[PDB]
Structure 1
Amino acid sequence: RDLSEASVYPEYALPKTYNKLHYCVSCAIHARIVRVRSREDRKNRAPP
């Protein structure tokens, strides 16, 4: 809202930032990008 009201240019696109975060297994587990799963459902290739 503040950026829209303080913008000079109307109908501004308001771009978004794009990046790829590569996590090692330890850091991913610690930061809960992934987590320990049960043995049967470790085989779920499907994301939620």
Structure 2
Amino acid sequence: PKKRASNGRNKKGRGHVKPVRCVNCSKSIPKDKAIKRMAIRNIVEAAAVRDLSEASVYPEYALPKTYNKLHYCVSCAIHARIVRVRSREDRKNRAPP
């Protein structure tokens, strides 16, 4: 007569969005998944701030910041970046610090 088999499990999204390659390892990835961080630092370090200020022409000067948005591939995020892994309850929470 007639007889056969199987299927499986679940998660949520939206529809479709275009990918943005991993800033570290060049893996493709969408932006609901994403894992993103804002790299917002000065050009100068804490050590460099004096040596410059001393040698600086112009009073007050400037000291701007290198801004850039960094996108990771989840795989690479756990390799280094602040993501790690949390408990059954903590993986529901969305607050950063």
Q: Same fold (TM over 0.5)?
A: yes
Q: How far has the Cα of 1:32 moved from its partner?
A: 3.5
Mark the runs of 5 or more structure 1 residues left unpaired by the alignment: none
Give 1 or 2 for the bigger CA radius of gyration: 2
Render the CA deviation track for 1:4-48: whole Å, top value 9, x for unaligned: 010111101111110011011000011132011001110011111
Give the structure, 1 or 2, with the largest relative contact order (CA under 8 Å, sep 6 or more). Answer: 2
1:12 aligned partner: 61
Question: How many equivalent pairs are there?
Answer: 48
TM-score computed with the length of structure 1 as normaliser:
0.89
TM-score computed with the length of structure 2 as normaliser:
0.47
Report SS of the residue matched to 1:20: strand
What percentage of residue pairs aligned between the two structures are identical? 100
RMSD of aligned alpha carbons? 0.9
Query: C-alpha separation between the residues in 2 aligned to 1:11 and 1:36?
Result: 44
Mark the runs of 5 or more structure 2 residues left unpaired by the alignment: 1-49
Report SS of the residue matched to 2:67: coil
